[PDB]
Structures are given as C-alpha cells and as structure tokens.
Write an enzyme that holds these catalytic residues in place. Structure first.
Site, PDB file in Angstrom:
ATOM      1  N   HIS B 152      43.503  43.325  45.688  1.00 10.57           N
ATOM      2  CA  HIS B 152      43.339  44.574  44.850  1.00 10.57           C
ATOM      3  C   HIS B 152      44.988  44.980  44.795  1.00 10.57           C
ATOM      4  O   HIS B 152      45.647  43.776  44.466  1.00 10.57           O
ATOM      5  CB  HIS B 152      42.637  45.566  45.504  1.00 10.57           C
ATOM      6  CG  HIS B 152      42.399  46.727  44.877  1.00 10.57           C
ATOM      7  ND1 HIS B 152      42.956  48.016  45.284  1.00 10.57           N
ATOM      8  CD2 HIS B 152      41.630  46.911  43.563  1.00 10.57           C
ATOM      9  CE1 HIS B 152      42.460  48.958  44.046  1.00 10.57           C
ATOM     10  NE2 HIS B 152      41.951  48.214  43.363  1.00 10.57           N
ATOM     11  N   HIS B 219      39.678  43.101  34.274  1.00 11.62           N
ATOM     12  CA  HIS B 219      40.083  44.396  33.736  1.00 11.62           C
ATOM     13  C   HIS B 219      41.358  44.346  33.841  1.00 11.62           C
ATOM     14  O   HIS B 219      42.263  44.873  34.337  1.00 11.62           O
ATOM     15  CB  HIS B 219      39.518  45.580  34.482  1.00 11.62           C
ATOM     16  CG  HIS B 219      39.640  45.648  36.177  1.00 11.62           C
ATOM     17  ND1 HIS B 219      39.164  44.679  36.830  1.00 11.62           N
ATOM     18  CD2 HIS B 219      40.154  46.744  36.616  1.00 11.62           C
ATOM     19  CE1 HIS B 219      39.753  44.939  38.052  1.00 11.62           C
ATOM     20  NE2 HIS B 219      39.974  46.161  38.141  1.00 11.62           N
TER      21      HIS B 219
HETATM   22 ZN   LIG Z   1      37.939  48.745  40.366  1.00 16.16          ZN
HETATM   23 ZN   LIG Z   2      41.002  47.601  39.447  1.00 17.60          ZN
END
Ligand SMILES: [Zn+2]
Ligand SMILES: [Zn+2]
Ligand SMILES: *[C@@H]1O[C@H](CO)[C@@H](O)[C@H](O)[C@H]1NC(C)=O
Ligand SMILES: *[C@@H]1O[C@H](CO)[C@@H](O)[C@H](O)[C@H]1NC(C)=O
Ligand SMILES: *[C@@H]1O[C@H](CO)[C@@H](O)[C@H](O)[C@H]1NC(C)=O
Ligand SMILES: *[C@@H]1O[C@H](CO)[C@@H](O)[C@H](O)[C@H]1NC(C)=O
Ligand SMILES: [Zn+2]
Ligand SMILES: [Zn+2]
EC number: 3.4.13.19
Lengths: 369, 369
Positions: B152, B219
């Site tokens: 992340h 994304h």
């Molecule tokens: Zn997310």
């Molecule tokens: Zn993300």
C-alpha cells in the site's frame, strides 16, 4: 493373544478417531513447516509419536489435527501463526494424498473410512487464535476449523482457563463473558464443535448450560482417577451425560497417574470411570500424542491403540462400547453439532467491547460511538 | 444525448468491472462492520459513493471489493483486520443475494453477468496483510483473495512502495527482495492477479520482468497527464504493452488533475493517453470510489460510469475499445492468470529470513531465534 486379535478385528471396521494430535506443532518447531525437507518425510519421520506407518499400524482412521499456537502469541501473532498451522495441515494432506483425506464433515470422516484413508480434520486449540473476533472465527471456519478449544493454558478476554482452578490464573470472566456467550452462540450457528479441554470448571459449566449442541473435551481425562485441573470432575461428567456430550481421554502420564510414570492399564481406568459416571456414549480418545513429553508404558506412540482396546475387551467392555469409544461417539456428537447449525441465521456481528481488547499490538478502527 | 444512449446500450452487454472500491473500509469506519445496523442498509446507504441503487444505475456488473487495512496495522493487527474485512465482504454478499454474487474466478464474473448480478470479488490491498507469510498468503487465497496489491503506501519487508519515488520512504528492497520474488512466484502458481498499484517504479519493473503472467494496476492513472507517483510512467506503460498487462484508472482528483479539483473530461484524458502508449487492451477502470475524498465533477458516485463511456464515444473510441475497457480487458488478464497457475506444483515454503521480520508483535517459533 485373543483380545489383541479381537481389537484388530473391530478396528478394521471401526478405526480410532482421535481428538487431539499435536504433530503440526512438531512440524513447525522441528522444520519450520518446510515439508519438502528430507528429515520431514512423514513416511519415515522419527523422533515423534506420529508418522504414517505408525498411524496405519495403530488402526487410526480419523484424526483431529491440532492447529496450535502457544499462549504467548495472544495479542501478538496468534492469528498469523494459526493460519500457518492450518496451512501445514492443508499441505500435509496434499503431499500425502494416499494416506490423508482432508475433511470438514461427519460424512467426510465416514468417507475416509470407506477409502482406507486417515480422515484429517482441523481443531483450533485456544480462543486466542481468533483474537476476540467473530470475523476471524468465521474465517477459520472457512479454512476448515471444526472444533475450537475455547482456551488453552491462558485466559482470553471472554473465557477462563483451567489454571484458574489451580490458583495460578485469576478468574477474569468467571466462565463466559457476554461476548464469550456470542462466541458460543456463533460456534453453534456455524456448526463448530465446542471443545472444553483446558477451560476452567466455571467455563465448562457455563458452556454446557449455554450450548445448544453437544460439546466435547478433545483431550481430557477423569479428575477422580487423577486430580488434575486439566481433568473433568464428576459433577461435570454428569452434565456431560445429561447433554450427551463427549470426553476424549488424554494419555499424558501426569493426567493419568498424576505422576511421571504411567501405563496402559491406568489409562483404561480413566475410561472405565468416565463410562460409569458419564455413561458409555460419552467416552472417546484424545491421546494428546506429540503434544506431551511423557506417554504411558504400552502406549508409546500412535501404533499402540489396538493394545488399549484389547485391555478394554479384557475388562469386559462390549463390542458396541468399544466401537463407540473408537469412532461412534464422536460421529454422534459431530452430527448433532451439524444438525444444530443454522447458516441462514444472521451471523453474530456485535464486536467485543473495546475496553476488553488487549495488548499493544492492535489498532482501534471501527470503534467510536 | 446520443452518446449517453449508446453508452447505456453497450453497457447492458458489457457492464463495467471496476478494479477497486473501498466500501468495506466505509462499513468498518461507519458501523464497525455491523451490517444489521439500519444505517448500514446498502439499498438506502447514504454518505458514500456506493450503494445498491447507485451500483445498478452506473451499470456496474463486476466489482473488486477492496479488503484494506491501514499501513499502521502492519506488524500489529493487519492479519486479524484483513480477515474481518474479508468477512464483511462475504456477509455483504450473503445479506444482499439479489444484488451481489461472490465469485473467485473469470467464469464466475461471466455468470454474474448472465444472472444480472454484481460479481463480487476480493482484492487485498497491501502486502502487510500476509505479514510476510506464504502460509497466510495461501489462507487468504482460500478465503477469496483474487488480487494482492503488493504494497500500500508503506514498504513491506519484501517490496517497495510508491513513496520511495517521492523521497518519503527509503528503498529497502529496491524492487523485490528474494523473498518478495517467491511471493510473486507463489502468486503465479496460485492464480492471483498481481496488483502494482501503490508500488515503486523499481517494484513495477521487477514484477513486470519476473511475473510469468500479466499484472494489473487496479487503481492507477497516467503519469504523463498528472505527475503523481501513484501514476504509471510511459516506460512502465511500454512494459504493460509487452506483457499484455492492464492499468485500471483511478478517479481521484489529485491523480487526475494533480489538484483538488477535477472533472470527467480529465479522466478521459488519462484513458486516451494510456490507450495511446500502453494500447487499447491495457486500459480499464479502478475508480477508487469510497477510498478517496475527492472525485471528478460528472463522476460523483458509482452511478456516473455511463457518462464517462459517453465521453469516450464522443472522443471517437470504437465500441470494441470501450467494451474492452469496460470488462473485456480485465477478463482477458484474469484468464491468463488462471492458465498460468500451477496448483499441482509444490507450494513455496521457504520462510522470510527472521532478521527481515520487523515489529515487536510476534514470536519466533519455527526459527527459534
Ligand atoms: Zn483502496
Ligand atoms: Zn489505493
Ligand atoms: C518419502 O520417502 C519415501 C521413502 O523414503 C519415498 O518413497 C517418498 O517418495 C517420499 N515422499 C516425499 C513426499 O518426499
Ligand atoms: C461381562 O458382561 C456380561 C454381560 O452379558 C456379564 O454377564 C458378565 O457378568 C460380565 N463379566 C464379569 C466378570 O462380570
Ligand atoms: C433495507 O431497507 C429496505 C427499506 O429501506 C428494506 O426493504 C430491506 O429489507 C432492507 N434490507 C436489509 C438487508 O435490511
Ligand atoms: C474514428 O474512429 C474510427 C473507427 O471506428 C476511425 O476509422 C476514424 O478514422 C476515426 N475518425 C476520426 C475523425 O478520428
Ligand atoms: Zn492441550
Ligand atoms: Zn495440544
């Protein structure tokens, strides 16, 4: 010997379904779960009470493999390690498909029997494995968990362990907390066997009254024969009979003779006591092989089972009574737990109160108002 | 509008399959995953970009629900929370069976399509979820995980995150560490989509070079149109072209316009660029709805998808080009990931070096060090 020959006759038709074997712990401590390591071949594994040829020699056709992570992993890496221990069992059954047949149903066990394979199920030993989460509990269930030992040798925020009855651990929930009750309610809904091995007497009683389905003691012996707090007292055994539960006998010397030395006869004494106080349909085997350092004389390893059955026969146990202790009682209780499950019922989703969560290894997202 | 009418026409036969929606995180944040709470009712849920009526109006027929736990949970309760978040996704699908259809394969998405349901898959965002464990990785796989976002916005002990490229983080692995390479190797054999969103350029290249199957940026947008390091540069876009990978565009304003304000036409700009550089089969959608605080004017929620498709038809994209961005390209990549998996092949079991495990929330069994 006639009795040993009779033991084998019955066992070919009713193999022993043991309730607690800690081989996965050995595989981790010894090989860090590296199953491709040569010293880790199960067909030749030595230094353990269990291995494939011993399981076959002992007529073992069903085993609840213990997914265990020590108490000091609670509020630490208990969840991660639990998943790793569940992985090694999944892998063990894939690496040795000619031996093990991974199952999660009472019907699956009967199938393993039919195929001459050792039915392999998962038993999660210790409530700290779910880290007070109903969601982790449902995840473990999906990963194969079919019995949860509410606690191990330590209190969880919602259930007290046996050390409370010896004075070492202080009573925290005095049985089950309101969240513990939801855990028990969730276990019934899911169809997971509730294991009472390692819990305090208050928890045993609280759960026996509360549980909608028959419970079990995956590896516990008689308190009257040996006054260990890891053993089941007579008033509880009467609750066991009343609810038609099951007590799976632990072979650990110190729970059998209450001392370091023990033998096969003393273990049969425990089985006899349970049979008179709790009834015959309440007796089973949960040897605790590979989890304990000292095992009885005559019950050195997992191949010694037929000898224990011969002794029961010698003592005049009927064929029905031994077949029940071998597999039938477990299958009765397992089926009951499945019939009592209701998956269309809304899962329990009310989290444990924040003030009850513990340790310095967590975050508090979700908690607010 | 002619284009809006054509968009709706094409979308009936090709629903949008979005690669990343953080609704799970909202359910956690707002109700502590209490789905029975009436405020939490998804048909009337307000204050989020997603809900049932909005999902239906946006012509969404496939959704990778993001199972996300913040970076601050790494070396803490990352695994616990990952399970809870995966649990909420499972229940959500169970609670609204008329809308949601939990799938774990490409044929499953195609079925959800035939039945008029929103295919629900799980994408775990951030490698800290597996807590450097191949065992936890396989556990998550069985629980539904169909894509793993390597990292992340924080480094794991085996991969570097995008913040390394802005100078906020120190490049630890400078791509993939040897263990990180096995994670990728394990992900390939299992059949899990490797998600390169949030990772460093070095990690992007290392993975595109190493992976035996196409990858995805669930994304991420075009670096050329908005120089954000959460966006993919053209060199990597050329790698996405060669490997036949896929970039699912992020709708966040600060990634689209590189500022707090953005509109629908600037999103179409990123799609145009990516279609130019990476190719028309390297483009898709991963809006990041309910994950970010700002979404473009014209794309306020998940119901706005037909408007973006209309703009693309306006910009002269062919029907096949939009059909591919809608669902066809993700499906192609997914099936290519399934065909490259080797379930028969032996699972990776060489653990990460103990010295590489950080934090003070773990025990060292298996290593003993
Ligand atoms: Zn997310
Ligand atoms: Zn993300
Ligand atoms: C285990 O060892 C036996 C004989 O030593 C051999 O036949 C078998 O292939 C080995 N199995 C594995 C999984 O290594
Ligand atoms: C063994 O059980 C049978 C039951 O039919 C009983 O008749 C017999 O007395 C028992 N044996 C002994 C030694 O008590
Ligand atoms: C959600 O609320 C609607 C009305 O607002 C109701 O018809 C529906 O049954 C509810 N669904 C659930 C799962 O509670
Ligand atoms: C629009 O796209 C079509 C393909 O459908 C192509 O043949 C044509 O050249 C394009 N027209 C313009 C003005 O770019
Ligand atoms: Zn035990
Ligand atoms: Zn044990």
């Amino acid at each position: 010997d006639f009795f040993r020959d009779e033991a084998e006759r019955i066992m070919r038709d009713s193999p022993v379904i043991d309730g607690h074997n800690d081989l996965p712990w050995q595989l981790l401590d010894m090989f860090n779960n590296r199953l491709q390591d040569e010293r880790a071949n199960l067909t030749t594994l030595a230094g353990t009470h269990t291995n494939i040829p011993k399981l076959r020699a002992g007529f073992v056709g069903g085993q609840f493999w213990s997914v265990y992570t020590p108490c000091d992993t609670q509020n630490k890496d208990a969840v991660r390690r639990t998943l790793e221990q569940m992985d090694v069992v999944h892998r063990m059954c894939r690496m040795y498909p000619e031996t093990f047949l991974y199952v999660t149903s009472s019907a699956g066990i009967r199938q393993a029997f039919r195929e001459g394979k050792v039915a392999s199920l998962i038993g999660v030993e210790g409530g700290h494995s779910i880290d007070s989460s109903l969601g982790v509990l449902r995840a473990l269930y999906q990963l194969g968990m079919r019995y949860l030992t509410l606690t191990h040798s330590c209190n969880t925020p919602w259930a007290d362990n046996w050390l409370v009855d010896t004075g070492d651990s202080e009573p925290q929930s005095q049985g089950l907390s309101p969240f513990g009750q939801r855990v028990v309610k969730e276990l019934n809904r899911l169809g997971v066997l509730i294991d009472l091995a390692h819990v305090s007497v208050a928890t045993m009683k609280a759960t026996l009254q509360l549980s909608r389905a028959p419970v079990i003691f995956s590896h516990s012996s008689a308190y009257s024969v040996c006054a260990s707090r890891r053993n089941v007292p007579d008033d509880v055994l009467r609750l066991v009979k009343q609810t038609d539960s099951l007590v799976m006998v632990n072979f650990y010397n110190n729970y059998i003779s209450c001392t370091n030395k023990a033998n096969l006869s003393q273990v049969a004494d425990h089985l006899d006591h349970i049979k008179e106080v709790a009834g015959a349909r309440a007796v089973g085997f949960g040897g605790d092989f590979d989890g304990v350092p000292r095992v009885p004389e005559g019950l050195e390893d997992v191949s010694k089972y037929p000898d224990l059955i011969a002794e029961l026969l010698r003592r005049n146990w009927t064929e029905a009574e031994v077949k029940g202790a071998l597999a039938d009682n477990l299958l009765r209780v397992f089926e009951a737990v499945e019939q009592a499950s209701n998956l269309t019922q809304a899962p329990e989703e009310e989290p444990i109160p924040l003030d009850q969560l513990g340790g310095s290894c967590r975050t508090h997202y979700g908690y607010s108002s």
